[PDB]
Amino acid sequence: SEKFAFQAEVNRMMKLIINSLYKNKEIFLRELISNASDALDKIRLISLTDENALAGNEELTVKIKCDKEKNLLHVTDTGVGMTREELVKNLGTIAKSGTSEFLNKMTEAQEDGQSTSELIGQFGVGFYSAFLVADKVIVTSKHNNDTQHIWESDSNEFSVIADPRGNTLGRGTTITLVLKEEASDYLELDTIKNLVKKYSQFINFPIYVWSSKTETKVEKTVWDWELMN
């Protein structure tokens, strides 16, 4: 449907982030998990004021799935979600007041030889680190005040469409990563489980990985959400 170019500062930001974490690519998952935590924190706080805030989906979880066969990684939360306008502005521009400070602090850091990965985490701009391991990033989101929408980008542009599938999330957001060939190891359950456990121990919400256990030629395989924190 509707196509957009990234704001120039976001193009600059993306490159800064990519270069900062280029040799620590796994950090992308830490940031997606941190963002999902923030979104969950937000709807939890809204529920203090809105008696019907959780009506679209009564759960408060992060859920992560590998799809080796389709080369996809999904990170789904039932947090606050994003309206169409929010997908466009939050992901495509320097929206928040603090974000603009990131760019300056990031540059002053890289000159003074200070660590920068803490800056990415502190300012919550880690979403773009997804492009370290993904050729395409897809964001499906449902907010109580809007219909379900899909944002998609290969980092050279982005587009937003209303989801033709309707409201499948209930409430929350899915980050779908179309993984680079070099990043296929993030499709392995053992790798993902190890990373999710490392980055979710400090999160105040339950995080699940869609895992499998095979028995016993005759084989029996059991699929279900394995709690990681």
Per-residue DSSP letter, 5: P
Told to check if 205 binds ligand N5O by CB under 6 A, we report: no
Per-residue DSSP letter, 137: E
Q: Which of 18, 25, 74, 90 binds ligand N5O (CB under 6 A)?
A: 90
CA 125, CA 198: separation in Å to the nearest integer? 20
Structure-token pair, residue 202: 């400090």
- CB of 173 within 8 A of CB of 85? no
Told to check if 121 binds ligand N5O by CB under 6 A, we report: no
Amino acid at 74: H
Q: Which is nearer to ligand N5O, 17 or 195 (CB)?
A: 17
59-88 residues in contact with ligand N5O (CB under 6 A) are 77, 79-82
Q: Which is nearer to ligand N5O, 130 or 187 (CB)?
A: 130
Q: Which residues contact 29 (CB under 8 A, 6 or more apart)?
A: 75, 186, 192, 195, 196, 199
Q: Which is nearer to ligand N5O, 77 or 187 (CB)?
A: 77
Told to check if 199 binds ligand N5O by CB under 6 A, we report: no
Angle between helix 189-200 and 27-49 (nearest 10): 50
30-59 residues in contact with ligand N5O (CB under 6 A) are 35-36, 39
Binding-site residue numbers for ATP are 35, 77, 90, 127
- What residues make contact with ligand N5O under the rule CB under 6 A? 35-36, 39, 77, 79-82, 90-91, 99, 124-125, 127, 173
